[PDB]
């Protein structure tokens, strides 16, 4: 066997027996021998056993050399930033993002926020600590606590221009996570009204587990925008990294068309610039990159695929359908911050609501939706779906399991890199009536 809490991207697993102290002091010592030199960014997340796993994954990076910046509760973004910005070795993020309260992980990262994934250091990571019995030794270097959000506060300001705001009211859904505090920082420096669902920061989670794609999350966001007349509304999950936006009528706006409308954003302030994009919806986002001047870049889903892309194409933006904004000034790194600003300033500048802005967009380029299914033979499931469509030829791209464009619609059928499970995403050029029946006939062929 191995430690099952050690994953294709980071470390998530059930407390105690997955993940506990005695691992994370573990983790640390063996995090300091895969880095270069420097001191070692530590941040966590709402979670009751947060601080403890952080503790201990401080005494082992002590333990062997290394010191360590406590930036304290915190999103996984700032994990990110402020490895970059204070030009440390590495960092580590205790967070179990969105999953059950008994759950807690690591998200890892080296020089620059560049990520630690199962073949770049976490699974020899993993093997280090499946094997190291040695005695704990003790601390020969010290933590320091730097708590200061200023400089965050300031790069994430520095994507609007402040005097072109207006006063948009808008719902912010934190989940019981850590988005709130965030936002209350930022509130003074802006000129929104702010209607705060789920707001305070409480690990035992007494509204649900931030999740804002379960219904009844979506559902709180929902109500507040439309009982409160507000112009859009935002959720995040539990650590921020991700952000789901409402708009004036309480609709969740598909993630796919936020990719385009970003996109656009970005690129009037850095014209002509590269943007990365995900291989599971892509007309829209290759038509609004290049209608606003902007050069498309195709790659394979997962934010260490895209950060590395966005890296060898100096790439201004990427985006994913599945919530996660990349953003060059930002070490490469994904924020659930930055998007809502880009948006609410592309509201105040536009004149036009969110749901407008993205409206002729969803009737050209209709979507299923990520769909998934569990089935018994993955392989054979995915061959009679091939097979069926064989004889109408499609273009076929193998980037992430496989893309299949018909002319009028697509397909993009993956296997997970998180869970094990089959995903599929289709697309229309304008057509509901088609791509309700390719996404119903592609699902029979798949639970056949
Ligand atoms: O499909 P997955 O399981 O392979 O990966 C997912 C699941 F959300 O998580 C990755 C990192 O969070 C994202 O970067 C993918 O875009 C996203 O889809
Ligand atoms: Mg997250």
Same mark, same amino acid.
């Given at each position: 066997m191995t430690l099952p809490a050690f994953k294709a991207y980071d470390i998530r697993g059930r407390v /105690? +027996?997955?993940?506990?102290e005695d691992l994370a002091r573990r983790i640390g010592v063996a995090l300091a021998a895969q880095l270069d030199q420097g001191p070692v960014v530590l941040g966590h997340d709402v979670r009751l056993a947060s601080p403890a796993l952080q503790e201990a994954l401080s005494a082992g990076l002590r333990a062997s050399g290394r010191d360590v910046i406590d930036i304290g509760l915190c999103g996984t973004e700032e994990v990110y930033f402020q490895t970059d910005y204070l030009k440390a070795a590495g960092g580590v993020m205790v967070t179990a993002?969105?999953? /059950?309260?008994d759950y807690n992980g690591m998200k890892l990262v080296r020089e620059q926020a560049r990520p630690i994934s199962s073949d770049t250091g976490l699974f020899a990571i993993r093997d280090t600590v499946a094997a190291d019995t040695a005695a704990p030794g003790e601390p020969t270097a010290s933590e320091q606590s730097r708590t200061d959000k200023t400089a965050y506060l300031e790069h994430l300001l520095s994507y609007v221009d402040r005097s072109t705001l207006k006063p948009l009211k808008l719902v912010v859904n934190a989940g019981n996570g850590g988005a709130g505090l965030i936002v209350d920082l930022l509130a003074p420096h802006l000129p929104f009204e702010f209607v705060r669902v789920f707001h305070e920061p409480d690990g035992n989670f007494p509204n649900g587990i /931030?999740? /804002?794609?379960?219904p009844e999350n979506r559902d709180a966001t929902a109500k507040a925008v439309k009982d409160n007349g507000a112009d859009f509304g935002i959720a995040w999950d539990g650590d921020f990294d991700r952000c789901f936006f409402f708009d004036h009528t309480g609709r969740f706006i598909e993630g796919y068309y936020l990719v385009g409308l970003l996109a656009q954003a970005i690129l009037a302030k850095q014209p002509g610039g590269k943007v990365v994009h995900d291989p599971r919806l892509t007309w829209n986002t290759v038509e609004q990159v290049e209608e606003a001047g902007g050069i498309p870049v195709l790659c394979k889903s997962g934010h260490a695929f895209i950060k590395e892309k966005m890296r060898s194409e100096n790439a201004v933006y990427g985006g994913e359908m599945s919530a996660h904004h990349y953003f060059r000034?930002?070490?490469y790194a994904d924020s659930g911050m930055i998007p809502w600003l880009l948006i609410a300033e592309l509201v105040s500048q536009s004149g036009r609501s969110l749901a407008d802005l993205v409206e002729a967009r969803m009737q050209k380029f209709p979507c299923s939706g990520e769909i998934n299914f569990k089935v018994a033979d993955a392989k054979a499931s995915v061959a009679r779906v091939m097979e069926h469509y064989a004889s109408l030829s499609p273009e076929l791209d193998?980037? +992430?399991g496989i893309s299949a464009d018909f002319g009028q619609w697509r397909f993009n059928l993956r296997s997970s890199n998180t869970e094990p499970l089959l995903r599929l995403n289709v697309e229309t050029r304008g057509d509901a009536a088609l791509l309700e029946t390719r996404t119903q006939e592609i699902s029979n062929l798949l639970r056949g």
């Open positions: /105690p +027996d997955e993940l506990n993002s969105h999953n /059950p309260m /931030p999740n /804002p794609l379960l000034e930002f070490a193998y980037t +992430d």
